[PDB]
Design an enzyme around this catalytic site. Sequence first.
Site, mmCIF file in Angstrom:
data_model
loop_
_atom_site.group_PDB
_atom_site.id
_atom_site.type_symbol
_atom_site.label_atom_id
_atom_site.label_comp_id
_atom_site.label_asym_id
_atom_site.label_seq_id
_atom_site.Cartn_x
_atom_site.Cartn_y
_atom_site.Cartn_z
ATOM 1 N N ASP A 1 -4.864 -34.936 -40.278
ATOM 2 C CA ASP A 1 -5.978 -33.249 -41.163
ATOM 3 C C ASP A 1 -5.249 -32.008 -40.783
ATOM 4 O O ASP A 1 -6.587 -32.023 -39.700
ATOM 5 C CB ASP A 1 -7.747 -34.097 -40.538
ATOM 6 C CG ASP A 1 -8.620 -33.103 -41.397
ATOM 7 O OD1 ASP A 1 -8.229 -32.536 -42.343
ATOM 8 O OD2 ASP A 1 -9.432 -32.789 -40.835
ATOM 9 N N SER B 1 -1.602 -19.739 -54.039
ATOM 10 C CA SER B 1 -1.392 -20.127 -55.281
ATOM 11 C C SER B 1 -1.196 -19.572 -56.062
ATOM 12 O O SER B 1 -1.831 -18.459 -56.321
ATOM 13 C CB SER B 1 -1.573 -21.405 -55.844
ATOM 14 O OG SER B 1 -1.221 -21.640 -57.197
#
EC number: 3.4.23.22
Length: 330
Positions: A35, A199
Amino acid sequence: STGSATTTPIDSLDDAYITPVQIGTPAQTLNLDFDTGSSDLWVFSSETTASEVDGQTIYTPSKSTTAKLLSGATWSISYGDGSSSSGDVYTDTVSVGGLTVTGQAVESAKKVSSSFTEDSTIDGLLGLAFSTLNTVSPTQQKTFFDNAKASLDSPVFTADLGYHAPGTYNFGFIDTTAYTGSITYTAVSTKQGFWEWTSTGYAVGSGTFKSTSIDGIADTGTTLLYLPATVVSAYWAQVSGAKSSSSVGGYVFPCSATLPSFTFGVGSARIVIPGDYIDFGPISTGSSSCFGGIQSSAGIGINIFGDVALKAAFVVFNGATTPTLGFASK
């Protein structure tokens, strides 16, 4: 040194991925959920409340000659999906894919929430976010990666998750045969303890690319792609019959649909998520309403590039002095 381990979907939907991890001496192999959105290595154990164990493999520290109680240490964690676990702490030898760390904090669960109990395939979590998020008290502990880093050939690990197929976690090297083209690297903020990056925009299907900054985290422990409501609405508007359902808890769509792809930007580069990656199947057995793999982050407080996004790429988690993230197509 290096390590290389195969990671395998837990079910037919890629709801999560498990990677075998050797703990203790002799080795006890548990299948852990790696994770990158948390920083605790915790396991089902011989100390876990019996009624809360249902099929998981447990770590038994008393059977490990290298286990040592970390005196006074406790841990308690709550995840974004509302699940939680807590317990005490041992140090022991932990190996992943041939890479061994001695003295790793292994957090032994005394209590786990129902969703963990109900998932027989996940024996615990191995956190790969920054150690500043580790919950051990009163002495915070380091992640497996943090402990291994100085010994690694290069201070990196990579995630290569499969779509409905196994993939690979590598530590200490970049497998140049595992991706196509070049890796595009992008800046990371560690301010919130995550692999947080921005992004450069998105496209829906064959549509034009929208240049827009989207701050979010690369999180292998989250199944879906969670993005701003504007972006998510633009995506689902291209699917006939798709709608946001408050009763179901997100966007659903007719199972008869063919889903468009979704593209996200990494610098000037582009990662394409095929439409099929966005299908999470019937909302309930036999339903013709299917659950979407792109969902709104509104009210999470952060955008999350979870498995839906990451599995479309070869992803480099670069833990150099100034960390960065790399993405390549594959």
